[PDB]
Amino acid sequence: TKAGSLTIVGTGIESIGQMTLQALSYIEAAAKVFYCVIDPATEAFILTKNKNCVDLYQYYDNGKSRLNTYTQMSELMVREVRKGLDVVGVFYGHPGVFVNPSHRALAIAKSEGYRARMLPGVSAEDCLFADLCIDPSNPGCLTYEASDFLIRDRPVSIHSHLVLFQVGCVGIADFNFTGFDNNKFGVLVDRLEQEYGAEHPVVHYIAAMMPHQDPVTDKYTVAQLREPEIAKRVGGVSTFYIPPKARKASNLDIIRRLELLPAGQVPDKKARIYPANQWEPDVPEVEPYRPSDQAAIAQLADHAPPEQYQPLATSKAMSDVMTKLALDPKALADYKADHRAFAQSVPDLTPQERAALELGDSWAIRCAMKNMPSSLLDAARE
Amino acid sequence: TKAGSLTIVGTGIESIGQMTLQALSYIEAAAKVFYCVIDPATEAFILTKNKNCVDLYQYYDNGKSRLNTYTQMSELMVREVRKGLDVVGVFYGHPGVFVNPSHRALAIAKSEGYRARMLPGVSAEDCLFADLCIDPSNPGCLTYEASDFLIRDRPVSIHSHLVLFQVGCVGIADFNFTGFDNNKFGVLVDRLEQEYGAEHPVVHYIAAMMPHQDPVTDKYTVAQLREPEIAKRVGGVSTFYIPPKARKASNLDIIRRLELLPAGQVPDKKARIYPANQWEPDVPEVEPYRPSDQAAIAQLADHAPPEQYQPLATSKAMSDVMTKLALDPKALADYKADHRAFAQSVPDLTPQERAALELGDSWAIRCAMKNMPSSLLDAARE
Amino acid sequence: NGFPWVIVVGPIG
Amino acid sequence: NGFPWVIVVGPIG
Ligand SMILES: Nc1ncnc2c1ncn2[C@@H]1O[C@H](CSCC[C@H](N)C(=O)O)[C@@H](O)[C@H]1O
Ligand SMILES: Nc1ncnc2c1ncn2[C@@H]1O[C@H](CSCC[C@H](N)C(=O)O)[C@@H](O)[C@H]1O
Ligand SMILES: [Mg+2]
Ligand SMILES: [Mg+2]
Incomplete structure (x- = not known):
């Protein structure tokens, strides 16, 4: 109002x-x-x-x-x-x-x-995942502001990703148009040495800001960050990525409670899903085409869409209105103010399409734009 | 090639x-x-x-x-x-x-x-920060896959944000078109009880997928997740946000090494920057307009751009080519193949603009599009 | 209603 | 060259 x-x-x-x-x-x-x-x-x-x-x-x-x-x-x-x-x-x-x-x-x-x-x-972290070819899911991700990381002694996990923002302005609460010298950078390096060791890799990351630029993806040891010519390269748009130093073992009680073991034992915790994190120290080459992979690829020849697959089955009029609601804030405001009035003034909609928009129910709209095979007999209603 | x-x-x-x-x-x-x-x-x-x-x-x-x-x-x-x-x-x-x-x-x-x-x-985590009105920087962010969180017993920090993806398919490695019942959800709830306590809040988050939809931002206690009617609401696009239960104190050695104390003591670690995380249990109302805030706002009346501020000073021709490099992958490929050939075939560029594009140097381009006042006398060259 | 179900990661180990 | 310098958070406490 x-x-x-x-x-x-x-x-x-x-x-x-x-x-x-x-x-x-x-x-x-x-x-x-x-x-x-x-x-x-x-x-x-x-x-x-x-x-x-x-x-x-x-x-x-x-x-x-x-x-x-x-x-x-x-x-x-x-x-x-x-x-x-x-x-x-x-x-x-x-x-x-x-x-x-x-x-x-x-x-x-x-x-x-x-x-x-x-x-x-x-975000810069979104860019980091894309450019360093890592997934925060594998094996978990800790994200901190570099000064806060130090001042509050925030915990690291040697088994997960670590991302540090603002590594170019350690302990600086003000501003200078010409940037800062980052004279307290050595305090951060001391903490990384304590947590990871002098020989552990740290990736200096700068996402390309112009479309033709390459990202900076420069791996250093914690020890190399003490070299003045390397320390000097860290600026206002610098982020650090610190990879895990070890793989964490599975908990037997959880394996049992989640019923992950058909009968008994398995090979290892190190038999990685391809691809391996290329930044981790001393990680072995992982085979992309194991026999299981080759068998899955062989099945592509005879593949057909499963009976419960829901093919798109929409209209130009419905795709046009859903695009307009996403790309025209005035159209979205008008629709949100009166679903029925808006729905009834869209030309060329089918009766089902008009009905779905009138309700504004996300499930009704999905149902109007996708073929629901008899087999699907889903529980979306239950 | x-x-x-x-x-x-x-x-x-x-x-x-x-x-x-x-x-x-x-x-x-x-x-x-x-x-x-x-x-x-x-x-x-x-x-x-x-x-x-x-x-x-x-x-x-x-x-x-x-x-x-x-x-x-x-x-x-x-x-x-x-x-x-x-x-x-x-x-x-x-x-x-x-x-x-x-x-x-x-x-x-x-x-x-x-x-x-x-x-x-x-990402869904990007949506979560926007919809729950939290910043991963304050006070750090741990992000895990829910099954991996349990199987590898990944650590939590009671002082930082926790985000869990795939909470609707705990222990499930296969697929069903009709979704899963999530029968091992109680194993996740047991872990959250151990780490946070039965009365700690968990936010059930679902980002709106259609433009008119509101996000789901439903706060439950860990204990309430054991109620079947609540457990049943967690599905394929459900994420959990668990807020911190405490504020972490500052480390005196780091305060000293970063020289954060002008002379001696200060009030507290709980005198928060506005606004407070609204999801945290028992966090006090934070004053948005403290005397310091009122003084900063009073200074707006007499504000002028500092001498070292760099106003935009570009041309339609240069803004057009930088837009084309960002929005036309073929133009970007052509530019990346031959900076000079590309730069010399752009009509209406000034000599400086042409020279900057010929080099492809990010700093030269920035310099061609922004006025560098004499005062700035920066160290960008040093 | 817990739909859709588009899970594109896991198991992670 | 460490530019630009557009820091829009901190101190955090
Ligand atoms: N081009 C870039 N490459 C890498 N990190 C960057 C970056 N630009 C900014 N950052 C990071 O972000 C910090 C500033 S805080 C602002 C972050 C921004 N809102 C975002 O969404 O990412 C920098 O100190 C650095 O750690
Ligand atoms: N609309 C939504 N709201 C909240 N979380 C969502 C979501 N859609 C997907 N997710 C999360 O993502 C998991 C699937 S994994 C795929 C995530 C996707 N690549 C991304 O960038 O976010 C879900 O189990 C859930 O935890
Ligand atoms: Mg790490
Ligand atoms: Mg937490």
């Missing part, structure tokens, strides 16, 4: 291309745009999409507490919300991943009764 | 809108598209963007090992790469976050000497 809204969106890390379609649609729809980005091509792109943009970066200053900057950034956005404007804040990467003023501005907007939403974006 | 390439991209979680601009551009440019997605509107959208698409979901079957499905999915993509095609694989969310066949297919393609890249996307 109340006039004014705050939508905070991300740009992703790589210039322009890592922005989501919905982030772009909200930037275009906004009355006012406030942005804080990491390259001028992304800034130029944003200014082509909205006539009313403010750069939040101008609220940093030499020796000015970042906390004071964050308060000001948040207040500039919430002031325009209180005036009844649809405001979009734009932060590079994911706007809620290692960002103070987005969470502050949204909490204030929400607490005062305005519509407030964060749209997720592609 | 070698014919054929594999690019794996994501769709994000929310239908269509959470796809990145670059993911869309690669789907449009591909000779062949292989996809595995979580809603039919996204599937329909992909089929409008490329004439040659294959649904990978048809390679699941009842009682068929997911490992055999993953081998087949990977082989269907690499077969087309070996034939010299530009192949795009599409997985929902981030295609490398809790995905086996993407990493497999890329490692095989890379090992055989083909061009292989993963483009990051918006």
Whole structure:
């Protein structure tokens, strides 16, 4: 009911291309745009999409507490919300991943009764998984701010991935336009030596910010981080990835309670699923085409879709309206205000399609766009 | 040099809108598209963007090992790469976050000497941070697969965020079109009781997959997860968020080595930065407008951009070419093949702009698009 | 209703 | 060269 809204969106890390379609649609729809980005091509792109943009970066200053900057950034956005404007804040990467003023501005907007939403974006950690060819699932992922990691003595797991953000500004709470020398970097290296040993690999990661750039994926030993010429390479957009040093064994009680053993024993805990983490120290070559793999590939020749497979069975009119709801914030607002009125004014919908949109039920819509074979006789209703 | 390439991209979680601009551009440019997605509107959208698409979901079957499905999915993509095609694989969310066949297919393609890249996307964890209004930085984040969490007895930190994926299929290595009953869910609840206590909150999180849907953000006690009517609500797209139960104190030795104390003591470790995590048990109301905040806001009236602030100073021709490099994979390939030839054939560039593109140096390009004030006299060169 | 079921990782060991 | 410097979180406590 109340006039004014705050939508905070991300740009992703790589210039322009890592922005989501919905982030772009909200930037275009906004009355006012406030942005804080990491390259001028992304800034130029944003200014082509909205006539009313403010750069939040101008609220940093030499020796000015970042906390004071964050308060000001948040207040500039919430002031325009209180005036009844649809405001979009734009932060590079994911706007809620290692960002103070987005969470502050949204909490204030929400607490005062305005519509407030964060749209997720592609973070530096998302880029890290893609560029270093690792999956956080295998074998779990710990993510920390480097100064917080040290000050609160946050635990590491030698059996899981470790990701450290802000390794270029250890112990620095203020700002300088020319960056910092990172004189307390050795305190971080001391902690990594204690946890992992002097010979353990650390990957210096910088995601490409321009589309033609290659990422920095430079493996050093903990010991090599003490060399001044290596330490000096760590800057404002540097992230560290520390791979596991060991594989963790399985718990026999859980194996029993989950009934994972048909009868008795198996080979090993080290018989890895291909591919192996290429950053882990002393990990063996894993065979991609084991006999089991070759047998699975041989079955492709005679493959047919299972009876319970649900083929897409939709229409141009239905795919057009679902695309419009995703890419047009005004259409989505209109639909959310009155499902029936909206549904009945969409041309060329089938009766089922119209009925599904009228209800707004996610399951009805899925059902209208996919063939449900008799065999599927699922429990979606039960 | 070698014919054929594999690019794996994501769709994000929310239908269509959470796809990145670059993911869309690669789907449009591909000779062949292989996809595995979580809603039919996204599937329909992909089929409008490329004439040659294959649904990978048809390679699941009842009682068929997911490992055999993953081998087949990977082989269907690499077969087309070996034939010299530009192949795009599409997985929902981030295609490398809790995905086996993407990493497999890329490692095989890379090992055989083909061009292989993963483009990051918006994961379910990215959605979780946005919808639950938490920052992984505050106070660190542990992310696990629920079965792996139990089988390898992965450590929790009561002082950091915990995120568990695949909580709806504890101990299940195969597949059923109608889903699973999740009969071993109680083994997970037992572990959460041991680590956190019966009264500790667990947030049942499901990101909206359709643009009009609200996310599920349902807080339960560990004890409430034992109620059959609550346990039954956990399905294939369910994630758990477990908030910290305590704030971790600062280490005095690190405080000293980072020189964080001007003279002596301070109030507390609990004087939180606004806003507080709303999911944490028994966390006090934090004041958003402390006297320090009010003073920072009062300074906005007399604010001017600092002398070292670098205003955008570019041209339509330069912003157009940087946008084209981000949104046109063919233009990017042409540019990467011959910087000089490409740069010299861009119309309307200034001499500086042409020179920067000729070099391809990220710093030269940034310099050509931003005004460097004399004051900045930075060390970017030193 | 717990749908969809698109599990594309695991077992992890 | 360690640029840019766009740090938008910290201190965390
Ligand atoms: N290009 C890049 N490559 C790697 N890490 C980067 C990066 N840009 C930023 N970061 C990381 O992010 C920190 C700043 S905090 C902002 C992070 C951003 N919101 C995101 O979603 O990723 C940096 O100190 C660094 O650790
Ligand atoms: N809509 C949704 N909301 C919350 N979690 C979801 C989700 N869709 C998938 N997930 C999580 O992801 C698991 C499948 S693994 C695939 C994850 C996907 N690649 C991503 O980037 O997120 C699910 O069991 C669940 O834990
Ligand atoms: Mg590690
Ligand atoms: Mg926790």
